[PDB]
Design a protein around this ligand. Structure first.
Ligand SMILES: Nc1nc2c(c(=O)[nH]1)N[C@H]1C(S)=C(S)[C@@H](COP(=O)(O)OP(=O)(O)OC[C@H]3O[C@@H](n4cnc5c(=O)[nH]c(N)nc54)[C@H](O)[C@@H]3O)O[C@H]1N2
Ligand SMILES: Nc1nc2c(c(=O)[nH]1)N[C@H]1C(S)=C(S)[C@@H](COP(=O)(O)OP(=O)(O)OC[C@H]3O[C@@H](n4cnc5c(=O)[nH]c(N)nc54)[C@H](O)[C@@H]3O)O[C@H]1N2
Ligand code: SF4
Ligand code: SF4
Ligand code: SF4
Ligand code: SF4
Ligand code: SF4
Ligand SMILES: [Mo]
Lengths: 234, 814
């Protein structure tokens, strides 16, 4: 089994809804976005092209992040996912240097520290981050998703790395990744690339698949098909 | 950190509760996922026939609005009697009873002094239960000054649809079946009125639709289009008119809709008049007169001289649209039409929807489907006392209907609101002083052009109360703050949406326990105020509510605030769930089923439904708008002048027949071009939930999803040509100055900007709202406030405020 994702760039509108859904699903600290993007503007006015490429962990066939991890925290599971036992992460950052894609973040900052602020912009009138935390019963942020804790820390400790887990906790329940469900055009499809009848396997036969940095030799399993833009008419 | 055993796992087991998002007037039906009493996720309501589970990205930002750490948790009163940008209100907490006591005393004092018309109700956003607070309460008090925000929104965009085909309203666009899409400034995968549905369909449609996007900036939509036309701001109608000209010369109008020459031969020859009797129109009126009076001379060469567009491109577009007809749809955005002469851009662009037959056709555009949703509570005439009956006849504070403010909504002189001009009436006490103001869900100091006029106006209002979740810029001038329960998570409401060939009606319902000591703006607050007014001897509102707004099943009035909140929605939606709505769409068996599904869908639109029966003077699609002539004649007769004198007084170039046909108005411009060499291209952020996500950190984290923009910054985008001219580099702190104001932000050089323009998102520049939205709350803004640059100007025929085309600016490094 080799789970992967096919992203249809023609359907993609570059809105970031996938990345925002990932924020709500996975309780990433402010500034940490497991789902992100690469956008490019090419050409000189008036012949200007803008492209947006959604990015995430490519859950690589030959993941260098796994190979360099000195503790075995970073590992492959039987679905082909690259997952992390965060409890064994010593924050050495070797995975980040090994990953060609820059999709791993390091929790140098205490996650959700801004929610410890109890100052009020209007005293005894407006509330505060800390007061909202108390009111809602949340631990770190009122937006924290407890589901995440099924398989991974809801709130990661400082001095550990983290990245896209392919919403493994949702897959375990037979559900879709949050970013897949969040996409208005259904541009994102996941499945088993080892199953020739899976939608993803058929998509990369119907369309020419493209990968990010295949030259790095990791065998990424996020495939991009079609074109964000179209050739200019007239 | 072991994985949890299956019986203790939590993924997927929480509850989804239906509501409606209002980040834009897409008004998408949603479900909220709730676990441990907290809202954790938002998704499109799968039952929605307009958009299904599809959503734009802003649905997720909703979660940082309800859980905004700068929300008000209590009513407050200011303790500084002075008001102003420089005056700290020194708000102190008070009770709801005391806050409403203060407001009630001020309202009653007006009535005792026989000046109830000096009360004003200001409405920003709203739901369809607004009639009570907005209209009924206001009129029962005795005021005509229920002032919506519509004219700072898009009223100019309704002029074409109304005066050509009788639709004072918006259209849905049949993208799934379109063969040609021409967008004058619309960016439907980022803004406009079904971002979820048009994002769902846009990329797929490129395989069967040729898409041209006309916008001074390379928008997301233009980036996914076959042609980006980087129009000079304010020149859109030039292209629309030249396309129509070529369509006639080439003989490729849509004959089943328009008609044809009686003898078959195409007699439209460039520059030369045609006999009206030689053409037989089918469902249109005025084609030959339009040609003879103007269109015969709107050649591709004429258009190329003005716009720089290659005439071969104009010609090819016209022919492509002819071949695609009637699967042709022309969009207009605020950018094209919210200009001082923009009524005729709406008309000129929308005329193409008639000429190519797209109006009410497959692949074209058409109005929202009929639904049985009620939009008003019962008549209140029997509850109007003599004080109120006299007061409601006073001239409105926004001066609508004066010679220079025809505001011809639905064909009526003074028919339309003039939101931005209410500040001018207030600050000039013309027609009279406003002494008591209640405002909700609005921030006109920030959202209206030259909003410092609202600073001035509100500082002159004896008593104002603001119904709001956050202390925004408008709130700074309030005597009393009335904190609102959040519309999307803590409120009973009802909204609608159109798209995908259907109209839907969706519920808003509380999905969490109310966080703070807030009340629902449109139901609980007017209910509580009516009780307070009755306690103080003015019980007409209370009697009206208790006798007219009663449960549709039990006939009983609400027992308390919370029951009333739901009752307001039950009352208006009863035609959907108490009655059989099968004739219009879904059959719902009960209120509970309506709440559980969360949405009612109409049947699919019947194509060509309106052909031959438009609500125009002629019942035709009017290229020569006898409908607009009648409205202008009414306004002219009211003011004892000619129509031409109205045009002159309203600063349009049109004279004679040109007042009634698609024609070229040179765009109004303000300021010396040599001092102010750049034209502002105001745009929305695709992460703006109107003016309401600037206090959401995720907004900034992903701000570069706006093409050309920069995460965690407020940038103005310049073409590199102008960057070199003005010595600007990426990241430079800059000041942009217009004749009326200035802002500071950062510079970004981007080739997707037309040279001579500067493209900058509206949405930042808050100095209040919250700690993330401002640098120093109450004092120093984050980013730059676009509307401080935009001179207070109007499309006087519609009442619309102008936000585009006329704004000249200069730039310098700070
Ligand atoms: N993301 C987001 N979407 C929204 C909203 C929001 O706040 N955020 N608000 C909703 C509401 S209330 C409204 S009324 C609608 C408005 O939706 P629309 O009427 O479609 O237009 P705007 O979103 O206001 O965008 C203005 C666009 O016009 C462009 N433009 C500016 N000047 C000119 C010009 O002279 N000519 C031409 N051709 N284009 C010009 C700008 O570049 C910009 O792309 O959007 C709704 N959709
Ligand atoms: N330069 C520029 N100006 C614009 C636009 C643009 O594109 N460019 N867009 C214009 C358009 S199309 C519109 S329609 C207008 C809208 O303009 P406004 O109607 O003034 O809307 P907002 O700016 O969103 O302010 C709404 C305010 O309600 C408060 N509030 C926030 N959330 C809630 C809630 O849940 N309940 C209640 N009771 N109050 C709440 C806050 O005070 C908030 O500032 O802005 C417009 N101004
Ligand atoms: S949600 Fe879908 S359309 Fe939006 S950026 Fe992500 S992949 Fe693209
Ligand atoms: S994308 Fe990077 S983090 Fe993800 S599996 Fe590949 S090497 Fe590892
Ligand atoms: S930072 Fe953690 S996951 Fe990465 S290599 Fe070091 S121990 Fe392994
Ligand atoms: S698969 Fe899940 S973890 Fe990965 S980017 Fe999508 S939402 Fe984030
Ligand atoms: S912000 Fe507008 S388009 Fe986006 S989900 Fe909300 S209502 Fe729909
Ligand atoms: Mo609007």
């Amino acid at each position: 089994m080799r789970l992967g994702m096919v992203i249809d760039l023609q359907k993609c509108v570059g809105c970031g809804g996938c990345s925002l859904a990932c924020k709500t699903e996975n309780n990433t600290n402010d500034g940490i976005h497991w789902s992100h993007h690469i956008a490019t503007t090419e050409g000189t006015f008036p012949d200007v092209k803008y492209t947006y490429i959604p990015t995430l962990c490519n859950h690589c066939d030959d993941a260098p992040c796994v190979k360099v991890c000195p503790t075995g925290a970073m590992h492959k599971d039987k679905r082909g996912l690259t997952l992390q036992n965060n409890d064994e992460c010593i924050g050495c950052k070797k995975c980040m240097n090994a990953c060609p894609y820059g999709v791993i973040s390091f929790n140098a900052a205490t996650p959700h520290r801004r929610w410890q602020d109890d100052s009020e912009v209007v005293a005894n009138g407006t509330v505060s981050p800390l007061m909202l935390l108390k009111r809602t019963g949340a631990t770190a942020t009122p937006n924290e998703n407890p589901e995440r804790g099924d398989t991974y820390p809801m709130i990661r400790p400082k001095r550990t790395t983290e990245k896209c887990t392919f919403c493994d906790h949702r897959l375990d329940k037979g559900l879709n990744p949050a970013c897949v469900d969040a996409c208005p055009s259904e541009a994102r499809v996941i499945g088993d690339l080892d199953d020739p009848q899976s939608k993803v396997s058929q998509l990369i036969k119907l369309h020419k698949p493209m990968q990010l940095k295949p030259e790095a030799g990791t065998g990424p399993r996020v495939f991009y098909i079609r074109s964000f833009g179209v050739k200019t008419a007239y | 950190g072991a994985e949890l055993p299956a019986p203790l796992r939590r993924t997927g087991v929480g509850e989804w509760l239906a509501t409606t998002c209002q980040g834009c007037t897409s008004w998408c039906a949603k479900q909220i996922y709730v676990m441990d009493g907290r809202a954790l996720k938002v998704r499109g309501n799968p039952n929605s026939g307009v958009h299904g589970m599809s959503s734009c990205p802003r649905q997720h930002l909703s979660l940082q609005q309800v859980y905004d750490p700068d929300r008000l948790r209590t009513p407050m009163m200011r303790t500084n009697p002075k008001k102003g940008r420089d005056q700290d209100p020194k708000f102190v907490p008070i009770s709801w009873d005391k806050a409403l006591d203060m407001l009630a005393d001020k309202i009653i004092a007006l009535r005792v002094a026989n000046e109830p018309h000096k009360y004003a109700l200001l409405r920003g956003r709203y739901s369809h239960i607004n009639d009570l607070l907005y209209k009924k309460m206001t009129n029962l008090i005795g005021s005509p000054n229920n002032i919506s925000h519509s004219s700072v929104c898009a009223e100019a965009h309704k002029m074409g649809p109304y005066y050509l085909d009788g639709n004072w309203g918006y259209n849905q666009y049949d993208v799934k079946n379109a063969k040609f899409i021409l967008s004058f400034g619309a960016d439907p995968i980022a803004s406009n009125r079904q971002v979820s549905f048009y994002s769902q369909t846009w990329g797929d449609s490129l395989d069967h639709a040729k898409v041209v996007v006309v916008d001074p900036r390379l928008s997301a939509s233009a980036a996914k289009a076959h042609k980006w036309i980087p129009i000079e701001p304010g020149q859109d109608s030039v292209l629309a008119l030249a396309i129509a000209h070529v369509a006639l010369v080439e003989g490729v109008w849509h004959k089943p809709f328009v008609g044809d020459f009686i003898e078959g031969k195409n007699l439209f020859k460039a520059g030369k008049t045609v006999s009206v009797e030689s053409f037989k129109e089918t469902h249109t009126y005025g084609l030959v007169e339009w040609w003879n009076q103007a269109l015969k001379d709107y050649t591709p060469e004429w258009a190329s001289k003005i716009t720089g567009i290659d005439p071969k491109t104009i010609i090819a577009i016209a022919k492509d649209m002819g071949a695609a007809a009637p699967a042709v749809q022309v969009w207009t955005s605020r950018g094209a039409v919210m200009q001082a002469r923009g009524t005729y851009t709406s008309i000129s662009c929308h005329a193409l929807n008639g000429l190519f037959g797209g109006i009410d056709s497959k692949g074209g555009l058409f109005p929202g489907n009929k639904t049985p949703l009620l939009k008003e509570y019962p008549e209140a005439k029997a509850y109007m006392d003599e004080i109120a009956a006299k007061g409601v006849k006073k001239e409105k504070i926004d001066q609508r209907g004066r010679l220079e403010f025809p505001a011809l909504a639905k064909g009526k002189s003074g028919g339309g609101v003039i939101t931005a001009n209410a500040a001018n009436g207030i600050r000039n006490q013309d027609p009279y002083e406003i002494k008591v103001m209640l405002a909700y869900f609005n921030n006109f100091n920030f959202s209206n052009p030259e909003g410092q006029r609202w600073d001035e106006a509100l500082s002159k209002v004896d008593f104002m109360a603001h119904i709001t979740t956050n202390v925004s810029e408008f709130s700074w001038f309030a005597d009393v703050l009335l904190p609102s329960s959040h519309h999307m998570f803590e409120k009973w409401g009802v909204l609608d949406s159109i798209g995908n060939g259907v109209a839907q009606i969706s519920i808003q319902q509380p999905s969490i326990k109310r966080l703070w000591d807030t009340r629902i703006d449109e139901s609980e607050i007017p209910y509580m105020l009516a009780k307070k007014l009755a306690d103080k001897g003015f019980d007409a509102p209370w009697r009206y509510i208790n006798e007219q707004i009663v449960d549709p099943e039990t006939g009983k009035p609400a027992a308390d605030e919370a029951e009333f909140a739901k009752l307001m929605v039950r009352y208006l939606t009863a035609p959907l769930w108490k009655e059989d709505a099968s004739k219009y769409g879904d059959k719902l068996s009960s209120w509970d089923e309506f709440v559980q599904k969360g949405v009612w869908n109409s049947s699919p639109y019947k194509l060509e439904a309106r052909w031959g029966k438009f609500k125009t003077e002629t019942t035709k699609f009017e290229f020569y708008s006898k409908t607009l002539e009648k409205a202008l004649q009414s306004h002219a007769d009211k003011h004892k002048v000619s129509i031409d004198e109205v045009m002159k007084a309203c600063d349009y170039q049109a004279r004679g027949h040109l007042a009634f046909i698609p024609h070229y108005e040179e765009p109004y411009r303000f300021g010396d071009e040599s001092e102010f060499p750049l034209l502002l291209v105001d745009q929305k952020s695709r992460l703006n939930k109107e003016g309401r996500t600037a206090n959401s950190p995720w907004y900034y984290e992903f701000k570069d999803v706006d093409p050309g923009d920069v995460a965690n910054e407020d940038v103005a985008k310049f073409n590199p040509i102008d960057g070199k001219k003005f010595g600007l580099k990426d990241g430079d702190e800059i000041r942009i100055t217009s004749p009326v104001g200035m802002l500071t932000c950062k510079a970004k050089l981007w080739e997707g900007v037309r040279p001579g323009t500067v493209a900058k998102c509206f949405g930042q520049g808050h100095w209040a709202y919250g700690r993330y939205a401002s640098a120093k709350f109450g004092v120093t803004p984050r980013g730059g406030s676009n509307n401080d640059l935009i001179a207070d100007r109007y499309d006087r025929l519609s009442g619309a405020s102008a936000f585009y085309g006329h704004i000249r600016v200069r730039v310098e490094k700070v």
